[model samples]
Target: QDNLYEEIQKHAKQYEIAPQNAMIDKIWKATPGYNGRQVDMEASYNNMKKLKKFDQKHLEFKEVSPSVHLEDLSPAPIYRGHPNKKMVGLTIDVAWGNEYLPRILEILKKHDVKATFFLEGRWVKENLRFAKMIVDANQEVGNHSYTHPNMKTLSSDEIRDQLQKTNRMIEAATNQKVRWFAPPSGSFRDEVVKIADDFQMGTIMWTVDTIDWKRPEPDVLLQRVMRKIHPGAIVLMHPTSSTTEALDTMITKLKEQGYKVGNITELLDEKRV
Candidate 1:
C-alpha cells in the first residue's frame, strides 16, 4: 500500500513533457508554441488507489504554458499550428466568385465548423451583405488586401495601404476587427510581413493548397488534401464550386482522421483545448 504512492511519484517525472517554444522556421516561418503537460501525482494516485492497481485511465494531466508565445516573436508568416496538435485551419480567400460563397456558408453551418474568410476590399464593397452574412454566421474574417496585387513588388507603405484599406472596409461593414492577413496569390516579402505585424496581425500562409480556382473535380480535391494532410495544416481554398463541393467530405474525412477542423485562431492557439 505504501509503495502505491511511491509508485505514482516515480511515474510523475516520466510523464512530464516540456513545453515547445515558438520559433522562426526557415521553411514555415513563425511557428506557434505548445503547452507542456505533467501528471498530477496526488490526484492520479488517489484514483489508482481506489482500483488498487496502476491504470492509464486514472492519469490526470495539467497543462503548463510556454514562456514564449507566437505574439512574442518577431514578425513572420504562420504556415500552420503546433505540430503536436491534431487541428487544421481552413482559410478561404474571397476576391471574386461571390456566387459560390452562400453554398460554402451553408455547408459550414451544416457541419458546425468555423473558418476564416479573407475578404478583399473591393469585393466587400460590392458584396456587403455577403460580408455581413459571414460575420453573422460566427466565422472569422481576415484582411486580404484592397486589390489582389503582387505584394513582393509593393513597397512597405503600399502594402500597409492595401492591408489597412481592407481592414477599414471589413470592420465598418461587419463590425469585426481583422486579426490576420492572407497575401494575394500567396505573395509576400519580409516588409509585407512586418507591415501586417505593425497592425497587430499575423501574416498567414497555407500548408495545403486546394487549387479550387481551376474548378477541379471534387474527388481530386479531396485526394490532394488527404495526401498532404497532417496535424496543424492550414488549407487554402477560394469561393469556387470545387471547394463548395469538397468542403463537407473534406471536413468529414478530417474528423474521421481525428482532427479538429477549426479557424486560424483556434488552430494557432497554444492551449490544448
Candidate 2:
C-alpha cells in the first residue's frame, strides 16, 4: 500500500498538464483552447488498493476545463488548435498531383490515419473517382474553392460562387457535408472569412506548410515538419512526391513524439483524444 501511494504521488506530479485559454493572436487569429488533465490520486489508489499493487490500468485522470473558449471570442480564421493538445492535423490540398494520391491514400490507410483533403471544384469535376476514394476512406473532405482563385481578389458574389458551387459539387460527388473552407493558397481577406462564416463554414488555415510542391527531399520535408510541429498544428501539404515519401515516417515520428495524428476536425475539437 505504501509503495502504491509513493508510485501514485510520483505519477500524479509527472502527469499533471495545464489548461490553455482560447485567444486571438496577432498572427494565428482565433486559436482554440484545450482542457488540462491531472491524475486522480484517490480514485487511482482505491482502484489499485484492492490488488495491493500499483496498476497502470487503475490510474484515472480528471479533466480541467478552460475558463475561456473559442466560442467566447469573435469568429476568425483558425491557424492552429489549442497549444495544450498533442494532436496534429495533416491536410492535403488536392489540385494537381492526382497520380500521387493512390500512394498517399495507401500510406494513410496502412497507418489507419485520417487526414483532411481540400478538393478544388474544378479538380473534383475532372477527378470524381479520386474524390470518391478520399471520402470512401472515411477521411474528412473540405472545400478548396472552385477554380482555385485568390479569395482576397474576388468579390463577395464570386467568393460565394466559389464556395457554394464547390460545396454543391463536392456534396453531389461525395455525399459528405462540407463544413470547412480553405481559401486557395491561403489567400483571404477579412470579408472572405466573414462570408465563409455566413455560409456556416469555418476558414481553415495551416500552422505549418510542407511546401511539398517544390519536391524537396523526403528527409528534408520530414525535418521541416518536425522542426515546426507543435500541439494542435494544422500542417499543409499536397499530393506530391515529397509528401508520399515522408508521410509514413512523419506519422511515426509524430507518434514517437507523443502526438495523435488526425484530421482538422479532431484537432479543432475541444476534447481529449
Candidate 3:
C-alpha cells in the first residue's frame, strides 16, 4: 500500500483532521483531487527522493598540504544533476493562470515527455479542476508556496510554515507528497535547507533559467536554450506563450543531441547513476 497517514500527520496539528484517522484517510483516499498518476509517477519519484538523500558520513571536507579531512559535511542543495550523460531536466513553474498549461500539456503529450510543475498553493485551491488536470496528464507537481515569496527573507519557522501550508494544499489536490521544492525567485537561506530536508523536500535549483517568465520572444527563448543548455542541466521555464511556442523545437534539438528531455525524476534514475 502506498500510505499517506504519516505524511498527513505532519500537517494534522494545524488542520482539523486527527492523525491517521481511518475514516478520514479513506475519505481522502477516494477524494476527487487526491489520486495517483497515469504515468510511472511512483517509480520515478521514489527513485528520485533517495538519489537526493545524503548523510554527513558520505562526504569529506579537505584541507591542503596537511590533507586534513573532515567527513561530517552536510548534504549540499542540488544545483544540477550529475552530468556525463545524454539526459536533462525541464521544469516548469505555474504560479498563475490555466491558459498556458493546457497548451504546454498538449506539447508535452505530443512528445511524451515528463516535466515537473511547481505550483503555488493558492493557485491550486482556486483551480482544483486544473490541479487534477495536471495529474490526469501524468505530470509531477512540487510546492511553490502559498504566495511567491523570497524564502531568504523569511525566518526559519516562517519558512517551514510556508512550505507546510503549500504541501497540504498540494496533497489535498493531488494526494502526492512533494519530493522537491523550488525556492521562490531562487531565494533561500542555508538554514531553510534543514527545514525542507526535515520535510523530505529536496532544495532544487536550476542550471539553466529560460527566463520565459519575462516574456522574451519565442526566438529569443529558443536562442537562450540553445546557448546555455547542457547534459544534466535543470532547465527552468514558465508556461508562457513564448515558451509554448519554443517547446517543439527545444525538445526536438534536445533529442537531436540524444538527450532525454523529461522530469527531474527521470533524470535521476539508477540507469543514469
Best-performing candidate as measured by TM-score: 1
TM-score of 1: 0.91
Per residue, candidate 2 scores C-alpha lDDT tens digits across 1-273 of 359889888778777878778899987799988888899888999999988887777888898888898778776999998877889998999988989999899899988888999999999999999999998888889999999989999999999899999999999999999888998999999989888888888899999999999999999999999999998899999999999999999999999999999998888777876
Cα RMSD of all models vs. native, in order, equals 2.2, 2.5, 17.9
lDDT of 3 by residue, 1-273 (tens): 423333333333332311111111121110001111122323333533554542222222211111111112243356654444357788888887588889889889999999999988888989998888898899999888778888898988789898999999999999987987888888877777778878887777788899988889998998898898886678998878889999988998888878888887676442431
Candidate 2's TM-score reads: 0.90
In angstroms, give how far residue 10 of model 1 lies from its true place.
Answer: 5.2
Q: Judging by lDDT against the true structure, name the best candidate.
A: 1
The true-versus-predicted C-alpha distance at residue 17 of model 1, in Å, is: 2.1
- Candidate 1 residue-wise lDDT, 1-273, digit = tens: 547778777778887889888988898889999889899877888889977887777888888989889998989899999888889999999998888888999889987898999999989988999999899989999999998899999988888899888999999999997899999999988899988999989999999999998889999999999999999999999998899899999999999999989999999998874
Ranking by lDDT: 1, 2, 3
- CA lDDT scores, all candidates in order: 0.90, 0.90, 0.70
Winner on TM-score between 2 and 3 is: 2
Q: Return the TM-score for candidate 3, rounded to 2 decimals.
A: 0.72
Alpha-carbon runs more than 4 Å astray in model 3:
1-73
Best of the two (1, 2) by TM-score: 1
lDDT of 1 at 175: 97
* Cα lDDT for residue 235, candidate 1: 97
